[PDB]
Amino acid sequence: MKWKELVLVKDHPMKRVYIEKVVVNIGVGTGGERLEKAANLLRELTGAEPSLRRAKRSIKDFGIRKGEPIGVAVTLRRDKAVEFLMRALQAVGNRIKRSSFDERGNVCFGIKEHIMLPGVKYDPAVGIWGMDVCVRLAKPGLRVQLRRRRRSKVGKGQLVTREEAVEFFQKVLGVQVD
RNA sequence: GCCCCUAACCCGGCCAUAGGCGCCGGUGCUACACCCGGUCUCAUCAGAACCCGGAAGUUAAGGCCGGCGCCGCGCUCGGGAGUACUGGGCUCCGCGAGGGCCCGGGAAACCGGCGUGCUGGGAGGGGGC
């Protein structure tokens, strides 16, 4: 069960749905060492290099200034995305709320503690963290919106719907959607 | 070479009649695409993008063309209207602020009507020299 054949296929070859990407986010308050622990935890958990996310706006109630890094997120595609997606679904319990699916092929779920993931051991030097995991599904032709030259809008029939995303998650990933 | 005719492609001009929303179609040899990969040039958290190498698949989408409705927009169109306003003259009216007459110019909102890109150069294709 790999990425290239994790596709949901309709009666047209060009309307195949697939996992465009999986993004894992840890949002921590400010800490230098706390953020380094979060970044290392994301690196070990996903196998990919995390990217530090700087605060967009200074909010003094949270004690964060604009430009300082308070997030650690990693974008996973193809094989690493599928492997971590299976691990994270096992951690959550193979269950996703139907109301968690937005109307455009995006589904995000939270992992409260990362020890629930398979293959992870409690460490006192790292503590216990949570994550947001967001899966973005797509059809072929999405590059028309993202390319540099002649960028245009993708037509409505070629965009992933909420019903198609829920059907993909049930029939292809074998997750229980309620 | 050179002349003529001509889709989608490339470089433009004016920059909505060109935009927005929704619905119905056409187009696929070639061209434009979606597309397939990441050895190399190059690139990032991420070959998503950019960059490179391709050609299995598809016109589903983009692009281009045709039709309809709405919003917006445009017009040297009819009305509004010779109206509002106004250049010059006056021993002309009014207590007065002001208004009037003559000569010369003359809108706008809005209503209805119509329209909904036009066009320059090149490639490619066809017909002659």
Can you describe this structure in just a few lines?
This protein has helices spanning about 30-45, 80-90, 145, 160-170; strands at about 20-25, 50-55, 70-75, 95, 105-110, 130-140, 175. The protein has about 180 residues and is an alpha+beta fold.
Notes on the structure:
By secondary structure, the chain is an alpha+beta fold. It contains four helices and seven strands; from the N terminus they run βαββαβββααβ. The strands form two sheets. It has a five-stranded antiparallel beta sheet. A two-stranded parallel sheet has the order 4-7. The radius of gyration is 18 Å and the shape is globular. The relative contact order is 0.20. The structure holds one RNA strand of 129 nucleotides.
Show the helix and strand layout.
Elements: E1 18-27, H1 32-46, E2 51-54, E3 69-76, H2 78-92, E4 95-96, E5 106-111, E6 131-138, H3 143-146, H4 162-171, E7 176-177
Parallel strand pairs: 4-7
Antiparallel strand pairs: 1-3, 1-6, 2-3, 5-6
This protein binds one RNA strand of 129 nucleotides through β1, β3 and α3.
